[PDB]
């Protein structure tokens, strides 16, 4: 098939097709599952071993993987992959902080405090001080990560007109501006389905803006 109908290639009579001289060759680690009739999964779906792929459930998947449905070659190909949840930044860190049970870690560190090594007792103490601090205070560790950044009242970061009629302002306004701009841009990028790289960079910039 081509852009202009006159440049298209149409078979004159009955025959078989052979593809030669490709631009390149792509080697993939995957499993090929040729399907005769109909496929019950689509490209982008993730599949564990034993999941129905095509042909009413006759052909299934041997391994974990991501689904690529080839309509041209008439085959459901499963690229070997895992569903792993591995994240980056303050989101992941906040998750880890939320999952923490402070009493348990206090117990573990207490058991660590009985170790004959001086250094290990020292580290265990240094950690247990923080843990017990959070325990006594009633503060949750995940609060060390900001979901909502406070805004200082405008009179403590004034925009004022000087004697000459010109304006003088606080740098906190500029910092706040950077933060708001990058946050808004991030939200738009998320709504528009930007690639992982762009979003990642934007999040980094956001973190450094809050910094």
């Amino acid at each position: 098939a081509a852009i202009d109908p006159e440049e298209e290639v149409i078979a004159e009579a009955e025959g078989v097709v052979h593809l030669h001289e490709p631009a390149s060759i792509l080697v993939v680690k995957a499993r090929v599952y040729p399907f005769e009739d109909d496929v019950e999964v689509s490209t982008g779906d993730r599949v564990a071993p034993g999941d129905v792929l095509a042909d009413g459930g006759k052909v299934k998947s041997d391994v974990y993987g991501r689904v690529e449905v080839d309509l041209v070659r008439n085959v459901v190909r499963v690229v070997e992959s895992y569903d792993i949840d591995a994240r980056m930044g303050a989101e992941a860190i906040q998750q880890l902080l939320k999952e923490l049970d402070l009493e348990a870690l206090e117990k573990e560190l207490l058991e660590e405090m009985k170790h004959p090594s001086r250094a290990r007792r020292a580290k265990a103490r240094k950690r247990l001080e923080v843990v017990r601090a959070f325990l006594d205070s009633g503060n949750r560790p995940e609060w060390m990560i900001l979901e909502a950044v406070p805004v200082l009242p405008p009179d403590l970061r004034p925009m004022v007109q000087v004697d000459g009629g010109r304006f003088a302002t606080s740098d906190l306004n500029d910092l706040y501006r950077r933060l708001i701009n990058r946050n808004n841009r991030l939200k738009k990028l998320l709504a528009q389905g930007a690639p992982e790289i762009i979003i990642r960079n934007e999040k980094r910039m956001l973190q450094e803006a809050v910094d």
Partner: protein
């Protein structure tokens, strides 16, 4: 350690396409959008909703978020409902689903492949008031617009069509975010034009041009006053933390008084004003003075209309005003004898 180096490294991880690859991805994208339109015609749902669900399944469990454009909130339950609603279609109608999926994947790969161009364009825009990475990100938005609007039918390289949108986005950003006090884009264009004009004028004349000369080189409609007001409105504010001395000792903002809050002298002035005004207002018959205060809002802090201030004490209309004046007549008596009100008039 360096965000820019890190991002440039993350950029070099995606290899650049070739002509066939570019045309392939573009084709898959266009045919993907067409497939989405087809599924819209078939299912009878919203093209935006279908597109967002397909995109949700392509991006995976990593990202799900509500889109402002959608009439319904976007959640994994909904994406599962719509996905299973799309998979329930017959094979020929189920084909467009696969087409749309591979289309979105192709879109992702296409955007990810061109990220270098955005950087090479944004490197020329440094020093406009925006950071390098900001320009790169806005340029990335431009690149996204380019991907979504591109047509491979015209046999044009993607860089050609993309460059325009990238420059457009970068410029819009520079015009929008560079000022603490926001100015509209057209006015920004006007100011930049004025700057270039003045620069040409000083270039040829060998001296800094006046408002009149600028008015001349700007053509018709432009006089000295307009140039002056435009330059006045183009002035950027200054930082309160701007260094004063030779050390870190003092700041600019320490020399600026607060004109808003009343000084103790002003407070005592208003207080004693109310005091003396209460001192000389009891000199005569109560109801008329209280009618005077009723008009001037000493009592309730509000001016009452003739019919209202009339209806207050049981009278009505024309009399009231003639009483106020009358009060103000007799008010001209008492004070004039004790003369206590002079200084408060400033």
């Amino acid at each position: 350690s360096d965000p820019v180096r890190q991002y440039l490294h993350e950029i070099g991880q995606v290899p650049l396409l070739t002509l066939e690859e570019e045309v392939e991805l573009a084709r898959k994208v266009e045919e993907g959008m067409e497939a989405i339109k087809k599924l819209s015609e078939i299912t009878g749902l919203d093209p935006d909703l279908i597109r967002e669900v397909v995109r949700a399944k392509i991006l995976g469990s990593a990202r799900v978020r509500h889109i402002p454009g959608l009439k319904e909130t976007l959640d994994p339950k909904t994406v599962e409902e719509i996905d299973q609603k799309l998979k329930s279609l017959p094979k020929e109608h189920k084909r467009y689903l696969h087409i749309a999926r591979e289309g979105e994947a192709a879109r992702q790969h296409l955007i990810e492949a061109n990220l270098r161009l955005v950087v090479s364009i944004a490197k020329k825009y440094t020093g406009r008031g925006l950071s390098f990475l900001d320009l790169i990100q806005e340029g990335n938005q431009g690149l996204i617009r380019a991907v979504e609007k591109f047509e491979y039918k015209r046999r044009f390289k993607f860089s050609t069509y993309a460059t325009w949108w990238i420059r457009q986005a970068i410029n819009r950003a520079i015009a929008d975010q560079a000022r603490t006090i926001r100015i509209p884009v057209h006015m920004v264009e006007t100011i930049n034009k004025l700057s270039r004009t003045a620069r040409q004028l000083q270039q040829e004349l060998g001296r800094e041009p006046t408002y009149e000369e600028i008015a001349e080189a700007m053509g018709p409609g432009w006089d000295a006053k307009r140039v002056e007001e435009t330059l006045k409105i183009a002035q950027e504010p200054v930082s309160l933390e701007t260094p004063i001395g030779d050390e870190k000792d003092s700041f600019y903002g320490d020399f600026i008084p607060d004109e808003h809050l009343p000084s103790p002298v002003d407070a005592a002035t208003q207080s004693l004003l109310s005091e003396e005004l209460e001192k000389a207002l009891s000199k005569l018959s109560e109801r008329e003075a209280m009618v005077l205060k009723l008009r001037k809002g000493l009592i309730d802090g509000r001016e009452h209309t003739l019919e209202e201030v009339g209806a207050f004490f049981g009278v009505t209309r024309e009399r009231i005003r003639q009483i106020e004046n009358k009060a103000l007549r007799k008010l001209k008596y008492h004070e004039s004898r004790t003369r206590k009100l002079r200084d408060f008039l400033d």
